[PDB]
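TEACHING EXERCISE
Course module: macromolecular assemblies
Task: Read the component lines below, then compare them to the predicted structure of the full complex.
Student: A.B.
Group: 4
Components provided:
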Amino acid sequence: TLNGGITDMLTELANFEKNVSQAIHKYNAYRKAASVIAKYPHKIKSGAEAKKLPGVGTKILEKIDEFLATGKLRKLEKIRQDDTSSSINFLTRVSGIGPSAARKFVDEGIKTLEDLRKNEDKLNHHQRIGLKYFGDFEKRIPREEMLQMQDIVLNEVKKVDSEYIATVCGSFRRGAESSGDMDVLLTHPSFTSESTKQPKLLHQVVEQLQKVHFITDTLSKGETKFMGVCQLPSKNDEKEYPHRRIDIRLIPKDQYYCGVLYFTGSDIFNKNMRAHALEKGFTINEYTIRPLGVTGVAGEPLPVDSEKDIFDYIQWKYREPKDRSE
DNA sequence: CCGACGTCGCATCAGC
DNA sequence: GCTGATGCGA
DNA sequence: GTCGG
Ligand SMILES: Nc1ccn([C@H]2C[C@H](O)[C@H](COP(=O)(O)OP(=O)(O)[C@@](F)(Cl)P(=O)(O)O)O2)c(=O)n1
Ligand SMILES: Nc1ccn([C@H]2C[C@H](O)[C@@H](COP(=O)(O)O)O2)c(=O)n1
Ligand SMILES: [Cl-]
Ligand SMILES: [Mg+2]
Ligand SMILES: [Mg+2]
Ligand code: NA
Ligand code: NA
Ligand code: NA
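Instructor-supplied answer key:
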Protein backbone atom coordinates (compact mmCIF):
# COMPACT_ATOMS: atom_id res chain seq x y z
CA THR A 1 0.00 0.00 0.00
CA LEU A 2 0.95 3.64 -0.58
CA ASN A 3 2.18 4.35 2.97
CA GLY A 4 2.46 0.81 4.26
CA GLY A 5 5.85 1.29 5.88
CA ILE A 6 4.53 4.16 8.01
CA THR A 7 1.25 2.43 8.86
CA ASP A 8 3.04 -0.79 9.87
CA MET A 9 5.37 1.25 12.09
CA LEU A 10 2.43 2.94 13.80
CA THR A 11 0.60 -0.38 14.21
CA GLU A 12 3.67 -1.92 15.87
CA LEU A 13 3.84 1.07 18.24
CA ALA A 14 0.12 0.70 18.94
CA ASN A 15 0.62 -2.95 19.85
CA PHE A 16 3.58 -2.11 22.10
CA GLU A 17 1.52 0.44 23.99
CA LYS A 18 -1.43 -1.92 24.40
CA ASN A 19 0.50 -5.11 25.28
CA VAL A 20 3.59 -3.82 27.15
CA SER A 21 2.85 -0.29 28.37
CA GLN A 22 -0.81 -1.16 29.01
CA ALA A 23 -1.67 2.34 27.74
CA ILE A 24 -5.03 1.88 26.02
CA HIS A 25 -5.39 5.49 24.91
CA LYS A 26 -1.97 5.50 23.24
CA TYR A 27 -2.92 2.23 21.53
CA ASN A 28 -6.07 3.86 20.15
CA ALA A 29 -4.21 7.04 19.17
CA TYR A 30 -1.60 5.11 17.18
CA ARG A 31 -4.30 3.01 15.50
CA LYS A 32 -6.29 6.13 14.63
CA ALA A 33 -3.24 7.74 13.00
CA ALA A 34 -2.38 4.54 11.12
CA SER A 35 -5.95 4.35 9.83
CA VAL A 36 -6.12 7.95 8.61
CA ILE A 37 -2.73 7.57 6.91
CA ALA A 38 -3.79 4.29 5.29
CA LYS A 39 -6.73 6.07 3.61
CA TYR A 40 -4.63 9.10 2.55
CA PRO A 41 -4.40 8.86 -1.27
CA HIS A 42 -0.85 10.27 -1.61
CA LYS A 43 2.55 8.80 -0.82
CA ILE A 44 3.59 10.81 2.22
CA LYS A 45 6.71 12.93 1.72
CA SER A 46 7.16 14.39 5.22
CA GLY A 47 5.97 14.38 8.80
CA ALA A 48 4.50 17.86 8.31
CA GLU A 49 2.35 16.58 5.44
CA ALA A 50 1.09 13.79 7.69
CA LYS A 51 0.48 16.17 10.60
CA LYS A 52 -2.30 17.78 8.54
CA LEU A 53 -4.36 14.61 9.00
CA PRO A 54 -6.61 14.35 12.09
CA GLY A 55 -5.09 12.02 14.65
CA VAL A 56 -1.49 12.64 13.55
CA GLY A 57 0.21 15.04 15.95
CA THR A 58 3.72 16.31 16.62
CA LYS A 59 5.24 13.10 17.97
CA ILE A 60 4.04 10.88 15.12
CA LEU A 61 5.12 13.49 12.58
CA GLU A 62 8.61 13.29 14.06
CA LYS A 63 8.59 9.49 13.85
CA ILE A 64 7.44 9.72 10.24
CA ASP A 65 10.41 11.98 9.44
CA GLU A 66 12.84 9.51 11.03
CA PHE A 67 11.18 6.62 9.20
CA LEU A 68 11.21 8.42 5.83
CA ALA A 69 14.87 9.36 6.25
CA THR A 70 16.22 6.01 7.43
CA GLY A 71 13.60 3.39 6.72
CA LYS A 72 13.50 2.65 10.42
CA LEU A 73 12.49 3.93 13.87
CA ARG A 74 15.08 3.66 16.63
CA LYS A 75 12.38 3.47 19.30
CA LEU A 76 11.10 0.27 17.75
CA GLU A 77 14.58 -1.13 17.09
CA LYS A 78 15.14 -1.00 20.84
CA ILE A 79 11.71 -2.44 21.69
CA ARG A 80 12.45 -5.40 19.41
CA GLN A 81 15.66 -6.04 21.42
CA ASP A 82 13.97 -5.96 24.85
CA ASP A 83 13.35 -9.57 25.91
CA THR A 84 10.47 -8.70 28.23
CA SER A 85 8.62 -6.79 25.50
CA SER A 86 9.41 -9.54 22.98
CA SER A 87 8.01 -12.15 25.36
CA ILE A 88 4.86 -10.20 26.20
CA ASN A 89 4.16 -9.40 22.55
CA PHE A 90 4.39 -13.09 21.63
CA LEU A 91 2.28 -14.33 24.55
CA THR A 92 -0.55 -11.85 23.82
CA ARG A 93 -0.92 -13.44 20.38
CA VAL A 94 -2.70 -16.34 22.10
CA SER A 95 -6.43 -15.70 22.30
CA GLY A 96 -7.31 -15.17 25.96
CA ILE A 97 -3.81 -14.00 26.99
CA GLY A 98 -3.97 -10.24 27.42
CA PRO A 99 -1.35 -7.74 28.59
CA SER A 100 -1.88 -8.57 32.28
CA ALA A 101 -1.74 -12.36 31.89
CA ALA A 102 1.25 -12.18 29.54
CA ARG A 103 3.32 -10.23 32.07
CA LYS A 104 2.32 -12.62 34.87
CA PHE A 105 3.31 -15.61 32.70
CA VAL A 106 6.70 -14.01 32.02
CA ASP A 107 7.22 -13.50 35.77
CA GLU A 108 6.53 -17.22 36.22
CA GLY A 109 9.00 -18.23 33.53
CA ILE A 110 6.34 -19.07 30.91
CA LYS A 111 7.43 -17.21 27.77
CA THR A 112 7.48 -19.55 24.76
CA LEU A 113 5.06 -21.71 22.84
CA GLU A 114 6.86 -24.72 24.33
CA ASP A 115 6.44 -23.23 27.82
CA LEU A 116 2.71 -22.81 27.27
CA ARG A 117 2.17 -26.37 26.00
CA LYS A 118 4.16 -27.66 28.98
CA ASN A 119 1.86 -25.71 31.35
CA GLU A 120 -1.63 -26.24 29.94
CA ASP A 121 -2.96 -26.56 33.49
CA LYS A 122 -1.92 -22.94 34.23
CA LEU A 123 -4.31 -21.77 31.46
CA ASN A 124 -7.97 -20.94 31.78
CA HIS A 125 -10.40 -22.48 29.28
CA HIS A 126 -10.25 -19.63 26.76
CA GLN A 127 -6.43 -19.61 26.79
CA ARG A 128 -6.20 -23.39 26.51
CA ILE A 129 -8.29 -23.27 23.32
CA GLY A 130 -6.34 -20.27 22.06
CA LEU A 131 -3.13 -22.27 22.45
CA LYS A 132 -4.58 -25.37 20.76
CA TYR A 133 -5.37 -23.35 17.63
CA PHE A 134 -2.50 -20.86 17.79
CA GLY A 135 -1.32 -21.56 14.26
CA ASP A 136 -4.82 -21.75 12.78
CA PHE A 137 -6.01 -18.47 14.23
CA GLU A 138 -3.32 -16.47 12.47
CA LYS A 139 -4.40 -17.82 9.07
CA ARG A 140 -6.81 -15.70 7.06
CA ILE A 141 -10.10 -16.94 5.60
CA PRO A 142 -10.59 -16.63 1.81
CA ARG A 143 -13.93 -15.07 0.93
CA GLU A 144 -14.76 -18.29 -0.93
CA GLU A 145 -14.50 -20.15 2.38
CA MET A 146 -16.49 -17.40 4.10
CA LEU A 147 -19.25 -18.08 1.55
CA GLN A 148 -19.22 -21.82 2.33
CA MET A 149 -19.37 -21.02 6.05
CA GLN A 150 -22.23 -18.58 5.49
CA ASP A 151 -24.22 -21.29 3.71
CA ILE A 152 -23.79 -23.75 6.58
CA VAL A 153 -24.67 -21.23 9.30
CA LEU A 154 -27.68 -19.84 7.44
CA ASN A 155 -29.08 -23.25 6.51
CA GLU A 156 -28.56 -24.78 9.95
CA VAL A 157 -30.17 -21.76 11.58
CA LYS A 158 -33.14 -22.16 9.24
CA LYS A 159 -33.51 -25.79 10.35
CA VAL A 160 -33.81 -24.81 14.02
CA ASP A 161 -36.46 -22.14 13.38
CA SER A 162 -37.21 -20.54 10.03
CA GLU A 163 -37.94 -17.25 11.84
CA TYR A 164 -34.27 -16.69 12.73
CA ILE A 165 -32.30 -14.35 10.52
CA ALA A 166 -28.51 -14.71 10.57
CA THR A 167 -26.40 -11.99 8.95
CA VAL A 168 -22.64 -12.32 8.42
CA CYS A 169 -21.03 -9.01 9.36
CA GLY A 170 -17.45 -7.99 10.02
CA SER A 171 -15.11 -7.48 7.08
CA PHE A 172 -17.18 -9.98 5.08
CA ARG A 173 -20.13 -7.58 5.01
CA ARG A 174 -17.70 -4.79 4.03
CA GLY A 175 -16.89 -6.90 0.96
CA ALA A 176 -13.37 -7.96 1.94
CA GLU A 177 -11.76 -10.70 -0.18
CA SER A 178 -10.52 -12.33 3.01
CA SER A 179 -11.50 -12.21 6.68
CA GLY A 180 -9.76 -12.96 9.95
CA ASP A 181 -12.83 -14.69 11.41
CA MET A 182 -16.60 -14.96 11.02
CA ASP A 183 -19.05 -12.62 12.75
CA VAL A 184 -22.73 -13.61 12.72
CA LEU A 185 -25.52 -11.32 13.87
CA LEU A 186 -28.62 -13.27 14.92
CA THR A 187 -32.23 -12.15 15.42
CA HIS A 188 -35.48 -13.92 16.26
CA PRO A 189 -38.92 -12.28 16.60
CA SER A 190 -39.26 -13.77 20.11
CA PHE A 191 -36.41 -11.55 21.40
CA THR A 192 -37.07 -7.80 21.23
CA SER A 193 -36.20 -4.79 23.37
CA GLU A 194 -39.60 -5.26 25.05
CA SER A 195 -39.61 -8.95 25.92
CA THR A 196 -37.90 -12.31 25.65
CA LYS A 197 -40.75 -14.67 24.86
CA GLN A 198 -38.64 -17.77 24.31
CA PRO A 199 -35.49 -18.89 26.18
CA LYS A 200 -32.32 -20.56 24.86
CA LEU A 201 -32.59 -18.71 21.53
CA LEU A 202 -28.81 -18.49 21.13
CA HIS A 203 -28.19 -21.86 22.81
CA GLN A 204 -30.38 -23.75 20.31
CA VAL A 205 -28.43 -22.34 17.37
CA VAL A 206 -25.03 -23.06 18.94
CA GLU A 207 -26.11 -26.60 19.81
CA GLN A 208 -27.33 -27.22 16.24
CA LEU A 209 -24.00 -26.00 14.84
CA GLN A 210 -22.15 -28.27 17.28
CA LYS A 211 -24.43 -31.15 16.32
CA VAL A 212 -23.30 -30.96 12.67
CA HIS A 213 -19.67 -30.53 13.82
CA PHE A 214 -19.39 -26.97 12.51
CA ILE A 215 -18.80 -25.41 15.94
CA THR A 216 -15.92 -27.34 17.52
CA ASP A 217 -15.01 -25.37 20.66
CA THR A 218 -16.40 -22.67 22.95
CA LEU A 219 -14.38 -19.77 24.35
CA SER A 220 -17.26 -18.07 26.15
CA LYS A 221 -21.02 -18.27 25.98
CA GLY A 222 -23.89 -16.32 27.47
CA GLU A 223 -27.49 -15.43 26.64
CA THR A 224 -26.63 -13.04 23.78
CA LYS A 225 -22.96 -13.58 22.80
CA PHE A 226 -21.17 -16.74 21.70
CA MET A 227 -17.40 -16.75 21.13
CA GLY A 228 -15.92 -19.94 19.78
CA VAL A 229 -14.33 -22.07 17.09
CA CYS A 230 -15.65 -23.59 13.88
CA GLN A 231 -14.41 -25.59 10.91
CA LEU A 232 -15.58 -26.32 7.39
CA PRO A 233 -15.96 -30.01 6.51
CA SER A 234 -13.32 -31.41 4.19
CA LYS A 235 -13.84 -33.99 1.44
CA ASN A 236 -12.42 -37.51 1.18
CA ASP A 237 -8.60 -37.59 1.24
CA GLU A 238 -8.57 -33.77 1.52
CA LYS A 239 -6.41 -32.07 4.12
CA GLU A 240 -8.61 -30.49 6.78
CA TYR A 241 -9.44 -26.80 6.74
CA PRO A 242 -7.96 -24.67 9.53
CA HIS A 243 -10.15 -24.06 12.54
CA ARG A 244 -11.61 -20.54 12.54
CA ARG A 245 -12.81 -18.06 15.14
CA ILE A 246 -16.59 -17.46 15.11
CA ASP A 247 -18.57 -14.88 17.08
CA ILE A 248 -22.38 -14.94 17.22
CA ARG A 249 -24.31 -11.98 18.63
CA LEU A 250 -28.05 -12.25 19.28
CA ILE A 251 -29.55 -8.75 19.02
CA PRO A 252 -33.13 -7.67 19.84
CA LYS A 253 -34.93 -7.88 16.52
CA ASP A 254 -36.28 -4.32 16.66
CA GLN A 255 -32.70 -3.06 17.21
CA TYR A 256 -31.24 -4.77 14.14
CA TYR A 257 -29.94 -1.61 12.42
CA CYS A 258 -27.94 -0.44 15.43
CA GLY A 259 -26.76 -4.03 15.84
CA VAL A 260 -25.71 -4.46 12.23
CA LEU A 261 -23.98 -1.07 12.19
CA TYR A 262 -21.97 -2.13 15.24
CA PHE A 263 -21.12 -5.65 14.03
CA THR A 264 -20.16 -4.47 10.54
CA GLY A 265 -17.48 -2.11 11.88
CA SER A 266 -14.62 -1.68 11.40
CA ASP A 267 -13.64 -1.20 15.03
CA ILE A 268 -11.92 2.10 14.20
CA PHE A 269 -14.88 3.21 12.08
CA ASN A 270 -17.13 2.54 15.07
CA LYS A 271 -14.89 4.55 17.42
CA ASN A 272 -14.74 7.45 14.99
CA MET A 273 -18.50 7.33 14.39
CA ARG A 274 -19.36 7.08 18.09
CA ALA A 275 -16.91 9.88 18.95
CA HIS A 276 -18.61 12.06 16.32
CA ALA A 277 -22.00 11.14 17.80
CA LEU A 278 -20.80 12.41 21.19
CA GLU A 279 -19.63 15.68 19.62
CA LYS A 280 -23.09 15.93 18.04
CA GLY A 281 -24.88 15.27 21.35
CA PHE A 282 -25.76 11.60 20.88
CA THR A 283 -24.48 8.26 22.11
CA ILE A 284 -24.59 5.12 19.95
CA ASN A 285 -24.29 1.51 21.03
CA GLU A 286 -25.31 -1.76 19.37
CA TYR A 287 -28.90 -1.24 20.57
CA THR A 288 -29.88 2.41 20.27
CA ILE A 289 -28.91 5.95 19.46
CA ARG A 290 -29.91 8.28 22.28
CA PRO A 291 -29.57 12.03 22.81
CA LEU A 292 -27.39 13.46 25.55
CA GLY A 293 -28.94 16.00 27.90
CA VAL A 294 -27.02 18.95 29.36
CA THR A 295 -26.86 16.38 32.10
CA GLY A 296 -24.38 14.29 30.20
CA VAL A 297 -27.01 11.58 30.77
CA ALA A 298 -28.50 9.62 27.89
CA GLY A 299 -32.13 10.25 26.98
CA GLU A 300 -34.66 7.94 25.37
CA PRO A 301 -33.84 5.90 22.24
CA LEU A 302 -34.54 7.61 18.98
CA PRO A 303 -36.53 5.93 16.17
CA VAL A 304 -34.25 4.04 13.77
CA ASP A 305 -35.56 2.52 10.54
CA SER A 306 -32.33 2.00 8.58
CA GLU A 307 -28.59 2.19 9.00
CA LYS A 308 -28.79 5.58 7.25
CA ASP A 309 -31.13 6.93 9.95
CA ILE A 310 -28.24 6.63 12.40
CA PHE A 311 -25.90 8.52 10.05
CA ASP A 312 -28.60 11.18 9.56
CA TYR A 313 -28.95 11.92 13.30
CA ILE A 314 -25.22 12.69 13.54
CA GLN A 315 -25.14 14.65 10.25
CA TRP A 316 -22.91 12.20 8.40
CA LYS A 317 -23.51 11.33 4.79
CA TYR A 318 -24.23 7.62 4.46
CA ARG A 319 -21.29 5.28 3.99
CA GLU A 320 -21.89 1.85 2.50
CA PRO A 321 -20.24 -1.03 4.43
CA LYS A 322 -17.46 -1.31 1.82
CA ASP A 323 -16.43 2.23 2.76
CA ARG A 324 -16.18 1.56 6.51
CA SER A 325 -12.91 -0.42 6.46
CA GLU A 326 -11.06 2.10 8.59
C1' DC B 1 -3.19 23.56 29.80
C1' DC B 2 -5.97 19.37 30.64
C1' DG B 3 -9.99 16.34 30.57
C1' DA B 4 -11.73 13.02 27.42
C1' DC B 5 -10.87 9.50 24.47
C1' DG B 6 -16.90 4.08 22.16
C1' DT B 7 -19.43 0.95 24.16
C1' DC B 8 -20.54 -3.37 26.07
C1' DG B 9 -20.76 -9.18 26.85
C1' DC B 10 -18.70 -12.98 29.40
C1' DA B 11 -15.12 -14.93 32.67
C1' DT B 12 -12.87 -14.22 36.84
C1' DC B 13 -11.88 -12.50 41.37
C1' DA B 14 -12.41 -9.97 45.78
C1' DG B 15 -15.24 -8.44 49.51
C1' DC B 16 -19.24 -9.13 52.31
C1' DG C 1 -24.79 -16.06 46.46
C1' DC C 2 -24.64 -11.14 45.19
C1' DT C 3 -22.12 -6.98 43.57
C1' DG C 4 -18.61 -4.45 41.70
C1' DA C 5 -14.23 -4.12 39.71
C1' DT C 6 -10.88 -5.98 36.31
C1' DG C 7 -9.34 -8.61 32.13
C1' DC C 8 -10.13 -9.73 27.50
C1' DG C 9 -12.78 -9.81 23.86
C1' DA C 10 -16.53 -8.02 19.96
C1' DG D 1 -0.70 10.56 21.61
C1' DT D 2 -4.02 13.81 19.91
C1' DC D 3 -7.61 16.89 20.12
C1' DG D 4 -10.87 20.79 21.45
C1' DG D 5 -12.47 24.06 24.61
N1 LIG E 1 -12.86 -3.08 19.57
C1 LIG E 1 -13.96 -3.50 18.73
C2 LIG E 1 -13.86 -4.70 18.05
C3 LIG E 1 -14.92 -5.06 17.25
N2 LIG E 1 -15.99 -4.28 17.15
C4 LIG E 1 -17.12 -4.63 16.26
C5 LIG E 1 -16.86 -3.96 14.86
C6 LIG E 1 -16.04 -5.00 14.06
O1 LIG E 1 -16.40 -5.09 12.62
C7 LIG E 1 -16.15 -6.09 14.80
C8 LIG E 1 -16.17 -7.50 14.30
O2 LIG E 1 -15.08 -7.81 15.12
P1 LIG E 1 -13.67 -8.24 14.42
O3 LIG E 1 -12.53 -8.11 15.37
O4 LIG E 1 -13.88 -9.62 13.89
O5 LIG E 1 -13.45 -7.14 13.22
P2 LIG E 1 -13.60 -7.34 11.61
O6 LIG E 1 -14.10 -6.02 11.13
O7 LIG E 1 -14.56 -8.47 11.29
C9 LIG E 1 -11.91 -7.65 10.87
F1 LIG E 1 -11.67 -6.86 9.75
CL1 LIG E 1 -10.71 -7.19 12.07
P3 LIG E 1 -11.68 -9.47 10.51
O8 LIG E 1 -12.29 -10.25 11.66
O9 LIG E 1 -12.38 -9.80 9.23
O10 LIG E 1 -10.21 -9.78 10.41
O11 LIG E 1 -17.20 -5.90 15.99
C10 LIG E 1 -16.03 -3.14 17.81
O12 LIG E 1 -17.00 -2.44 17.70
N3 LIG E 1 -15.04 -2.74 18.59
N1 LIG F 1 -30.40 -10.56 11.02
C1 LIG F 1 -31.41 -9.82 10.51
C2 LIG F 1 -31.33 -9.29 9.18
C3 LIG F 1 -32.37 -8.56 8.72
N2 LIG F 1 -33.48 -8.35 9.50
C4 LIG F 1 -34.64 -7.53 8.96
C5 LIG F 1 -34.55 -6.05 9.29
C6 LIG F 1 -35.37 -5.41 8.16
O1 LIG F 1 -36.72 -5.17 8.54
C7 LIG F 1 -35.32 -6.44 7.02
C8 LIG F 1 -34.63 -5.95 5.75
O2 LIG F 1 -33.67 -6.90 5.27
P1 LIG F 1 -32.24 -6.38 4.75
O3 LIG F 1 -32.08 -5.02 5.33
O4 LIG F 1 -31.22 -7.25 5.38
O5 LIG F 1 -32.27 -6.27 3.27
O6 LIG F 1 -34.64 -7.61 7.56
C9 LIG F 1 -33.54 -8.88 10.80
O7 LIG F 1 -34.56 -8.68 11.48
N3 LIG F 1 -32.49 -9.63 11.27
CL1 LIG G 1 -29.51 1.00 25.07
MG1 LIG H 1 -14.39 -10.44 12.10
MG1 LIG I 1 -12.32 14.44 21.89
NA1 NA J 1 -3.08 16.34 12.72
NA1 NA K 1 -4.34 -12.38 23.21
NA1 NA L 1 -14.97 -11.60 15.44
